[PDB]
Design a protein around this ligand. Structure first.
Ligand SMILES: Nc1nc(=O)c2ncn([C@@H]3O[C@@H]4COP(=O)(O)O[C@H]5[C@@H](O)[C@H](n6cnc7c(N)ncnc76)O[C@@H]5COP(=O)(O)O[C@@H]3[C@@H]4O)c2[nH]1
Ligand SMILES: Nc1nc(=O)c2ncn([C@@H]3O[C@@H]4COP(=O)(O)O[C@H]5[C@@H](O)[C@H](n6cnc7c(N)ncnc76)O[C@@H]5COP(=O)(O)O[C@@H]3[C@@H]4O)c2[nH]1
Ligand SMILES: [Zn+2]
Ligand SMILES: [Zn+2]
Lengths: 346, 347
C-alpha cells in the first residue's frame, strides 16, 4: 500500500546519477548559448532564471531578459496573454521587433530561434539538433546526443506590479503566510512568447520553484527529523503516474496533451486545501498521495484546472484539451485508484 | 443424569491443550496483522478488543478503532443498524470513506479486507487463506493450516452514551447490580460493518458479554473459593455443545445451519436474569440448572422469539432471520433430546 509507494520512490532514486550526468551536459550547452547570445545587441543582458527536470532526460531552462518598463494590454479577455509595448518612446535595442508600439513575440522568437540554430552548427563538440515540440510553445527545444532534450525558453522580465488577472491567484495565505504572498508578489514576473502572433503570456515558474522548495507551513519543514513531510514525494509520485500512463497509451497517444505542469498545478491546489504540515506527515504517504489523486480526478471530470496564479485561466479548457482525452484519462486514473495502482507493480 | 453431563464436561477438558495451541497460532497471526494495519493512516489507532472461541476450531477476534465523536442515525426502524456520521464538519483519515456526511461501512470494510489479503500472500510462514463466511458478515475470515478459522472483525469504537435502542437492554439489575449496569453502560460500544444497504453498521457489545461471563455471580467472589462454585459456565458449555453436536448430526441437509453459539449465549444470559441468585446455580444442581437453560431455549424456538440481550426490540429468532421451518425443526430435536436424558451425550 503505502509501502508500495516507497518502493516506487526507491526505484526513482536509482536514476538520480543518470539524470545528473544528463544535466551536466545540459549546463555546458546552456552556458555556451548564454555567451553568444550576449554578443547580440538585442540579447545582451540576457541571463539564466532560477539563479530544470520535467521528466527523466527532459530539461527546462529559461532565459530572462531585462527589459525597460513595460506597458501591458490584455489580449481579448484571455487572462494570461498580453500585448507588449514600452512606456518611454530614447529608443532601445528591442525596436527591431516593434510593430507600431507592439513588441512582436514571433519576431523575437524567430531571431532567438535563429541565433541558437547558428550556434548549434559550428559546434563540433557534440550532436545537437533543433526540433519543434508543438505549435504554440514559447520554447526552443534541443536534442543533445539524441537522448536528452532541452526546452530553452526566452523570457522578458518585468519588475512592475503583477497584472490584475493575478489578483485572486496565489492563494497561499492559509498555507504559507499572507506575508509570504506579499513578499513573492514583489518579485518580477515574466512574459514568454507563447501566443494564443504578437502575444506574450505570464510565467511564474521562479515562484513555482520557490513554493516547492520552501513548501511548509513551518519554516523548518524538512530541515530536521521531526518535520519530514511528504509533499515532494507526492508530486514525484503524481508526475510518475502520469508518465507511466502516457507510455502505456503509447499506441494511440490518447494522453499526449497532458503534462507534468497540469500535475504540478493540481498539486499546488491540494497544498492550498491541506495547508498544515501535519497533513503531509510521511507516515500518511499513502493517504496524502490519495488526496492528490482524488483532486486531479475532480479536475478531469469537471474539466477545470485553474492556473495557480491566474484563476480564470483554465488549463483543462476544451480549447486546450479535447473532452475525449479528459474523459479517457479519468477512466484510467479512476481504475488505477480503485485497485491500489497496478501501474506501480513489481 | 448429572453424571452424564459431568462426563461431557470431562470429555471437553481433554481438548483443552489442543485448542490452546491453535489459539497460540491465531494470536501470532493477529499480532502480525495488527502491526501492518498500524502502518495505514486510516487504521493506525487500531487495537485488539478484550468470545475468543465460538467453536472447537473457530476463533473470533475483534479489532477496535478509535473514532472521533460519532453521530448516529438509526436506519429504518431496525434497532441495531445505524448510519455513522461525524460531528465535526479539520477531519480525520476516515474522510476517504465518506459519502456526503455518512461513513461508509462497505468502503471501509473493503480496504480492511484488501490490506489483510496483502499480508496473507507474501507470508511464507504458513498456508493462510482468505474466505468470505456468509452474506452480511462484518468479518474477514482466515483459514490457518487448513484446519483453523479466525473471524477478524473491524469495530469502530464510540465512547459516547449507548443509543436509545439499548435503554431497556442489559437487564442485569437483580443479578449483577443496578450499579454494575451503570458502570458497564459507561464503557464504550462498538459498530461493525455488518450491513442491513452497504453503508450501515450495527452495534456490538461483545466486550460486555465477556465481562458478565467472567464476572457472573451475584456474589463478587463467585467461583473464587471452594464454597462458591456455581455451574453457570458449565451450563453455557453444555448448551453450546448441544447445538454443535446436533448441527453435526444433521450434516446432511444442513437444517440447523442458521443457528449459532451466539443464540445459545444470548439465551443463557436471559436465563441468568431469570435466575439471579448463585444458589439457583449450585454445582450440585447441575442437571436441574442445565434443564432451565434447555427449556428456555425451547420456549424461544417455540415462541420464535429470542431478543438481543442489549437490544430487546431486536429479535434474533424472527422469521426475517431464521425461517419458521428451521425453528420448528430444532424444537423437535431438542424436545426429543430433553425428553430422553440427552442421547447425544451418550458414550
Ligand atoms: N518548456 C515550456 N515552458 C512553457 O512555459 C510552456 N508553455 C507551453 N509550453 C508547451 O508549448 C505547447 C503549447 O501548449 P500551451 O501553451 O497551449 O498549454 C500549456 C501551458 O498553457 C501550460 N504551461 C506549461 N508550462 C507553463 C508555465 N511555465 N506557466 C504557465 N503555464 C504553463 O500548460 C499547458 C501544457 O503544457 P505542456 O504540455 O507541458 O507543453 C506546452 C505545449 O507543448 C511550454 N513549454
Ligand atoms: N465474527 C462475527 N461477529 C459478528 O458480530 C457477526 N454478526 C454476524 N456475523 C455473521 O455474519 C452472518 C450474518 O448473520 P446475521 O447478522 O444475519 O445474524 C447473526 C447475528 O444477528 C447474531 N450475531 C452473531 N455475532 C454477533 C455479535 N458479536 N453481536 C450481535 N449479534 C451477533 O447472531 C446471528 C448468527 O450469527 P452467526 O451465524 O454466528 O454469524 C453471522 C452470519 O454468518 C458475525 N460474525
Ligand atoms: Zn516539508
Ligand atoms: Zn460462579
Amino acid at each position: 500500500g503505502a509501502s508500495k509507494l516507497r518502493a516506487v520512490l526507491e526505484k526513482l532514486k536509482l536514476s538520480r546519477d543518470d539524470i545528473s550526468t544528463a544535466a551536466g551536459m545540459v549546463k555546458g550547452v546552456v552556458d555556451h548559448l548564454l555567451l553568444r547570445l550576449k554578443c547580440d545587441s538585442a540579447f545582451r543582458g540576457v541571463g539564466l532564471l532560477n539563479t530544470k527536470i520535467s521528466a527523466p532526460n527532459e530539461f527546462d531552462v529559461m532565459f530572462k531578459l531585462e527589459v525597460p518598463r513595460i506597458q501591458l494590454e490584455e489580449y481579448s479577455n484571455t487572462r494570461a496573454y498580453y500585448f507588449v509595448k514600452f512606456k518611454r518612446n530614447k529608443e532601445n535595442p528591442l525596436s527591431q521587433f516593434l510593430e507600431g508600439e507592439i513588441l512582436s513575440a514571433s519576431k523575437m522568437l524567430s531571431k532567438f530561434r535563429k541565433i541558437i540554430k547558428e550556434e548549434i552548427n559550428d559546434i563540433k563538440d557534440t550532436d545537437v539538433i533543433m526540433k519543434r515540440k508543438r505549435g504554440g510553445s514559447p520554447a526552443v527545444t534541443l536534442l543533445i546526443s539524441e537522448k536528452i532534450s532541452v526546452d530553452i525558453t526566452l523570457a522578458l522580465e518585468s519588475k512592475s506590479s503583477w497584472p490584475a488577472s493575478t489578483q485572486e491567484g496565489l492563494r497561499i495565505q492559509n498555507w504559507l503566510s499572507a506575508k509570504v504572498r506579499k513578499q513573492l508578489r514583489l518579485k518580477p514576473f515574466y512574459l514568454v512568447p507563447k501566443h494564443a502572433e504578437e502575444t506574450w503570456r505570464l510565467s511564474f515558474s521562479h515562484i513555482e520553484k520557490e513554493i516547492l522548495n520552501n513548501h511548509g507551513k513551518s519554516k523548518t519543514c524538512c530541515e530536521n527529523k521531526e518535520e519530514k513531510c511528504c509533499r515532494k514525494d507526492c508530486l514525484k509520485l503524481m508526475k510518475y503516474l502520469l508518465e507511466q500512463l502516457k507510455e502505456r497509451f503509447k499506441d494511440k497517444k490518447h494522453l499526449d496533451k497532458f503534462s507534468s505542469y497540469h500535475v504540478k498545478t493540481a498539486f499546488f491546489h491540494v497544498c492550498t486545501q491541506n495547508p498544515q504540515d501535519s497533513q503531509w506527515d510521511r507516515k500518511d504517504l499513502g493517504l496524502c498521495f490519495d488526496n492528490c489523486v482524488t483532486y486531479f480526478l475532480q479536475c478531469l471530470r469537471t474539466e477545470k484546472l485553474e492556473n495557480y496564479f491566474i484563476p480564470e485561466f483554465n488549463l483543462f479548457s476544451s480549447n486546450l484539451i479535447d473532452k475525449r482525452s479528459k474523459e479517457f484519462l479519468t477512466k484510467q486514473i479512476e481504475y488505477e485508484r480503485n485497485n491500489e495502482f497496478p501501474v506501480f507493480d513489481e
